[PDB]
Design a protein around this ligand. Structure first.
Ligand SMILES: *[C@@H]1O[C@H](CO)[C@@H](O[C@@H]2O[C@H](CO)[C@@H](O[C@@H]3O[C@H](CO)[C@@H](O)[C@H](O)[C@@H]3O)[C@H](O)[C@H]2NC(C)=O)[C@H](O)[C@H]1NC(C)=O
Ligand SMILES: *[C@@H]1O[C@H](CO)[C@@H](O[C@@H]2O[C@H](CO)[C@@H](O[C@@H]3O[C@H](CO)[C@@H](O)[C@H](O)[C@@H]3O)[C@H](O)[C@H]2NC(C)=O)[C@H](O)[C@H]1NC(C)=O
Ligand SMILES: *[C@@H]1O[C@H](CO)[C@@H](O[C@@H]2O[C@H](CO)[C@@H](O[C@@H]3O[C@H](CO)[C@@H](O)[C@H](O)[C@@H]3O)[C@H](O)[C@H]2NC(C)=O)[C@H](O)[C@H]1NC(C)=O
Ligand SMILES: *[C@@H]1O[C@H](CO)[C@@H](O[C@@H]2O[C@H](CO)[C@@H](O)[C@H](O)[C@H]2NC(C)=O)[C@H](O)[C@H]1NC(C)=O
Ligand SMILES: *[C@@H]1O[C@H](CO)[C@@H](O[C@@H]2O[C@H](CO)[C@@H](O)[C@H](O)[C@H]2NC(C)=O)[C@H](O)[C@H]1NC(C)=O
Ligand SMILES: *[C@@H]1O[C@H](CO)[C@@H](O[C@@H]2O[C@H](CO)[C@@H](O)[C@H](O)[C@H]2NC(C)=O)[C@H](O)[C@H]1NC(C)=O
Lengths: 142, 206, 142, 142, 206, 206
């Protein structure tokens, strides 16, 4: 039973208190298989090598730092800080014009049993959540 | 909760028998009913005959006294539980007249969705598949939870997630998400349309 | 024999009649393994969880709706409408200047046997097909 | 033991002599499993179908060809030229303003035993290497 | 369709034997031939000797009457089918003189591509590998289908896909896609070059 | 290379026994030592007693002559190899006084990281986990390779990769990457700050 998961954007996704993006796990397209979920984080059951990914839909009515960071982060008892795994820097944007930009990344990382993975967009304000088919976060063992 | 469909015959008469199963004394507001030629529009309001229960096996019996051409069609045993909110969809069986007559019931009908070799009756709009139809068993249908919807006769195992109208894009819910309709986004109090994605506003400014 | 496939942009890709993007299956880099193809759609043989993906090369000589939708859609007998799975909104573009923008997405979705998946770019006119190594659509079971 | 690998940007990545991008294999997030590495190239041990991918972080202080090519290429004894597999064309950029753009692609390609895969960004000057969590190249068998 | 290479010896003479297999009575327009020191440029026009067939095992025999230094080189048994369009590439074997002489045939030659332990003769430009060379068997080569091409001596199992010149970028096919050359894109009737990607126009305006 | 911790008792006395394993005649510059109440700050400089070796099983013995309250605490057997450059972290065991006393050693201590059911002593800053602590065995720690670092008491199996300061962004290494600190980026000779990402310059112009 190969560990797999796909989590979707929700109404509580944007804590915006320096908290990582939260995700839906059961409703519609969301699912977990051999992976737990705790406070915005995929939680590894079976240790090993996982292809991890995340898309985030970005946009707005014009521009408020143009540099915007979207990344995947390891939490672990093996280190007191978060560990950057896969990270992108965009800069898509007067404020008279509306704009949209998707930001996808994925990659194979090694995860020990109990180690967590979270998504962080650096200016949460710019995250646009419509129906959750626009922004997601998941993984599968390889 | 079980549903069955059987058709016993005695001389000139022909009995159609919807059989229903439910927890004793939770049947108050429970209805079993039969439908002739209802394209998943089957309800007590559109039934031939019904039995609203009052308080573990229940039964509905519709007897056809004479074999005639106009009684030919497609019948469906259906149940509805008030306390549960659960619907129940029995298999699509057919009467066909020729002189003679025969009962009957891979290219499943519009109202059905395929499950392995078998076909299964679809659930109502705003109703999710709780249990797949067995060979003898019928389709079980739970209502969508809040924040979800299904807008069609469906065989979906999970309800579609309602669209959120983003305040920060100057949008608000023009129509609210009912369990049979998605929400729709128009512009906020004192905002106007910048661009449109379809026949709806994508983003609004004040 | 783990179901896998990778399909490439073709001369018939842009039906542009509200039809989904069509793909090549046998020529060059294109292939099918334990997956059928019918009228622009990957067709599932073995039911289960598939990582699905699509890249589309976009560009042109300037700009004609700047908002442009690139998505992956489920067809099924279990619902009369198409079901959005994974979708992006871009806005890359006077018309004096030439521009290019790639749009990639992927994600793990559950697919029942006989269920279809298609790609749709909302303004097909902006799809720039060169050798088919620019635009593609495929999947593999996870 | 399913072949997998993830390689990260390094100080020698930008040879910039018409050479392909070089990668780190052992340090930090980098790893090889059932795949060899030779002169900027993943080297197949076990022949078959691989999902391959690459992200590159791009940016700079303004603009010097705006069209920029990021692609995955097959080397093989079966053909004297390199073979394009998966390729994107971007155009993200006065020079007064700083900008960032990530370029991700992935796809399933068939690779015979001993066949190589490399990454090429067409103007290496635009590749911005920070900690190697910004730019990477890897694969896994499907 | 099979190909073999054998070299029988009798006193002073030395026979080289190309052996070919084909469906009886589909050999009209069929040619088996031998090549000395042809770097995959081997053809009837560049053969030492050939046998054009007319109508299941066929044979070509080239006898070397005397062992001499100038007969030393690298030989190849090759067959061409007209009806099929299929080429056939036998293994690269060598004659080497010293006084004495020896016949012969992991660092495969330029004209070969590795397959497991063995090496295999490459297919002609515009020719795809239909079948890998066996230990005794030779490389089989199908011609590229239309809309595809291979521009080199190759061991590719599938032909490269021809590039489409995008009308909407004001481009047209300067050169059409032959089975040995990719197509090339220049500007449309009454259009000019905006930017160039190499020594070709990327996009054109009118 | 093995590490063990045993505590033998005889009348009034109590012996603590660090046991170390090493290749014969590669022990020159080798140190085994014991630490009372060191929060992973355990070193020869902060040891109770040590044994610097000179030249396969080695041993350190610290005897407590009398059972007293002030001898109560948390002890750790540690070893340091000069030639290998490897640290060695034995399990955290405890003496507790009450009258009486007891020796001892899922909510692992700050200095530990969990591995299955067990807890393991963390490695020093600039030291990677070479081998996980066994039930009897201790944590083995390799130093970070060049171009990498770890800036904390850690249980990481691989060192963090040092940040490169991009010349093309007008940046240079303000601080160089030590094995215990990441590198830091300031502006190049004759360049100034454009924007800041934290308390460091993101990009510089001249
Ligand atoms: C969609 O549903 C929401 C509720 O989930 C609707 O917003 C609600 O509308 C009601 C009725 O107008 C509001 O009632 C109000 O109560 C205040 C007292 O606080 C009273 O002074 C007003 O006269 C009014 O009756 C209610 O406040 C509001 N709910 C919330 C939480 O704000 C919404 O109108 C629906 N949308 C559409 C377009 O139907
Ligand atoms: C590449 O191949 C295409 C065909 O696949 C070439 O276009 C074709 O060119 C021929 C020869 O000029 C055209 O023939 C014409 O027929 C009309 C009658 O309708 C006649 O009046 C003209 O005098 C001319 O002979 C043919 O129409 C055209 N094919 C199509 C479908 O339009 C193309 O020219 C080739 N490109 C190059 C640069 O060689
Ligand atoms: C971080 O480490 C690097 C070395 O990896 C430091 O750059 C090096 O600095 C030394 C000491 O200033 C340079 O030595 C010089 O040698 C020349 C002779 O060629 C002499 O004329 C100078 O007086 C000077 O002593 C050395 O050249 C240089 N290394 C290289 C390869 O250029 C760097 O300074 C360190 N950064 C910081 C901020 O500490
Ligand atoms: C549908 O449900 C009813 C009630 O649950 C079934 O009758 C039961 O069947 C089980 C298993 O055969 C028996 O253990 C019970 O004794 C029955 N319960 C009662 C109270 O009679 C019935 O068999 C089902 N019908 C079909 C066609 O599946
Ligand atoms: C190449 O092909 C020929 C013709 O197909 C082979 O001869 C046949 O071999 C099969 C299997 O050994 C026999 O069943 C047939 O009787 C043969 N056919 C005829 C008509 O003779 C030949 O063995 C092959 N040569 C090599 C070296 O593989
Ligand atoms: C730690 O290491 C020492 C030395 O390697 C171990 O003693 C050896 O144990 C192996 C396996 O039991 C024996 O084959 C050897 O004979 C021993 N070597 C010598 C030279 O004595 C010791 O058992 C280990 N201790 C623990 C607690 O794991």
């Amino acid at each position: 039973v190969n560990p797999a998961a796909h989590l979707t954007g929700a109404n509580s996704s944007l804590t915006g208190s320096g908290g990582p993006l939260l995700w839906e796990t059961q409703l519609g397209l969301a699912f977990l298989r051999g992976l737990s979920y705790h406070d915005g984080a995929l939680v590894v059951t079976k240790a090993g090598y996982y292809y991890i990914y995340s898309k985030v839909q970005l946009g707005g009515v014009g521009c408020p730092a143009s540099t915007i960071t979207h990344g995947l982060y390891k939490r672990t008892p093996r280190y007191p800080e978060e560990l950057e795994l896969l990270v992108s820097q965009q800069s898509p944007c007067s404020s008279s014009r509306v704009w949209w930009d998707s930001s996808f990344l994925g990659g194979v990382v090694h995860l020990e049993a109990g180690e967590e993975v979270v998504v962080r967009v650096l200016d949460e304000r710019l995250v646009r959540l419509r129906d959750g088919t626009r922004s997601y976060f998941g993984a599968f063992m390889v | 909760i079980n549903i069955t469909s059987s058709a016993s015959q005695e001389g000139t008469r022909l009995n159609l028998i919807c059989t229903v199963w439910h927890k004793k004394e939770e049947a108050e507001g429970f209805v079993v009913f039969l439908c002739k030629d209802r394209s998943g529009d089957c309800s007590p309001e559109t039934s031939l005959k019904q039995l609203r229960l009052k308080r573990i096996s229940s039964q509905l019996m519709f007897t056809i006294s004479q074999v005639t051409p106009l009684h030919s069609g497609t019948y469906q045993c259906c149940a509805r539980s008030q306390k549960s909110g659960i619907r129940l969809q029995g298999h699509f069986f057919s009467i066909l007249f020729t002189g003679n007559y025969t009962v009957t019931g891979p290219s499943c009908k519009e109202d059905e969705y395929p499950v392995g070799s078998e076909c299964c009756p679809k659930c109502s709009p705003g109703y999710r598949v709780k249990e797949a139809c067995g060979e003898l068993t019928g389709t079980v249908c739970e209502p969508c939870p809040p924040g979800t919807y299904i807008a069609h006769l469906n065989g979906l195992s999970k309800c579609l997630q309602c669209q959120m109208c983003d305040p920060a894009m100057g949008l608000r819910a023009s129509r609210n998400c009912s369990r049979t309709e998605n929400a729709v986004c128009g512009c906020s109090p004192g905002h106007f349309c910048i661009v449109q994605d379809g026949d709806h506003c994508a983003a609004c400014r004040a």
